[PDB]
């Protein structure tokens, strides 16, 4: 599956970084699971995960730094409370969970740059 | 979340092993995802996954050895084509996916014992 997202995004002084994550849905999917994987220092870190039902708003799995809202066949993710050390490649994994068949999409990733104020 | 399932189940000569997996649903959940995790030799193996929907019959994710039918707030799982080497602890992970909030349940696990005929 094809998954497109911004190549680079700058985090604000507060430490908030928003980025879109659109996917070319082949079938008429109802359930979609968007998962944010942070890749840095040759290790993967599952930042957050959310389930998007087509006719309803995006819901994130319990407590995470991620917020956002869905719109058709794309999601506007918003990562909060970022610092300098969090700077890495934020890969956007999409999965069409229901109905069958199962489709997997992994984007190139959004390199979110962060710096600490004073 | 509380998830109950048989402690031990014996697989038939053909290699079929059925077991129930009931869960104490706190809220009025419509979508529920039952996942069979086989734990053996200090490693987890995702055997299969089924999405219970309100208005539909239990639907397994693409092709698996698992079949079964839902009945209210429980599922009767049926694992087929098992052999001696498959013998392990079949843990039954339940997730209330929709509507919010998200609930996770993981049972103690059903130790399925299997024997090869001659």
């Amino acid at each position, epitope marked *: 599956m094809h998954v497109a997202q911004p190549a680079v995004v700058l985090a604000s002084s507060r430490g908030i970084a928003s980025f879109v994550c659109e996917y070319a849905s082949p079938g008429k999917a109802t359930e979609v699971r968007v998962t944010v994987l942070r890749q840095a220092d040759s290790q993967v870190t599952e930042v957050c995960a959310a389930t998007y039902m087509m006719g309803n708003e995006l819901t994130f799995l319990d407590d995470s730094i991620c917020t956002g809202t869905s719109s058709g066949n794309q999601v506007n993710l918003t*990562i909060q*409370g970022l610092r300098a050390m969090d700077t890495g490649l934020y890969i956007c994994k999409v999965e069409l969970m229901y109905p069958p068949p199962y489709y997997l999409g992994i984007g190139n990733g959004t390199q979110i740059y962060v710096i600490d104020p004073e | 979340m509380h998830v109950a399932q048989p402690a031990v189940v014996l697989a038939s000569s053909r290699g079929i092993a059925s077991f129930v997996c009931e869960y104490a649903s706190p809220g009025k959940a419509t979508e529920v995802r039952v996942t069979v995790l086989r734990q053996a030799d200090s490693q987890v193996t995702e055997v299969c996954a089924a999405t219970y929907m309100m208005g539909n019959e239990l639907t397994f994710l693409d092709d698996s050895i698992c079949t079964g039918t839902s009945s209210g707030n429980q599922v009767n799982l049926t694992i087929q084509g098992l052999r001696a080497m498959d013998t392990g602890l079949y843990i039954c992970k339940v997730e209330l996916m929709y509507p919010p909030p998200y609930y996770l349940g993981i049972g103690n696990g059903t130790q399925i014992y299997v024997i090869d005929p001659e």
Partner: nanobody
Amino acid sequence: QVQLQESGGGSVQAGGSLTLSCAASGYANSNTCMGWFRQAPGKERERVAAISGVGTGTYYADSVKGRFTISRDNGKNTLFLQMNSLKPEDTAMYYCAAAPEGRAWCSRDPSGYNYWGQGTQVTVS
């Protein structure tokens, strides 16, 4: 494998203060959610607090909201629970937990934590 060991627990007077430590060891990925759970005599383990594996993100129970604080040292080796304004209801067996290595986001149910510490008792008069 990851191994957690608690310390700094004990009995104190009501309206007092304590600081629980949980020295975490043997991490492949140190960007993992850690949390604190307490178990009263008979009742099940409820989550008091939990911190995100990535960035600053603390999450608390309403029962201890404002009075308790969860924090991590620079190296992410030791997890702390700053306990202030201790009430008799806070009396329980406190456990420090960790999510599966790599899982930054924090489960509310204790079923979503793989690694646990032996536990430490906290009594409040």
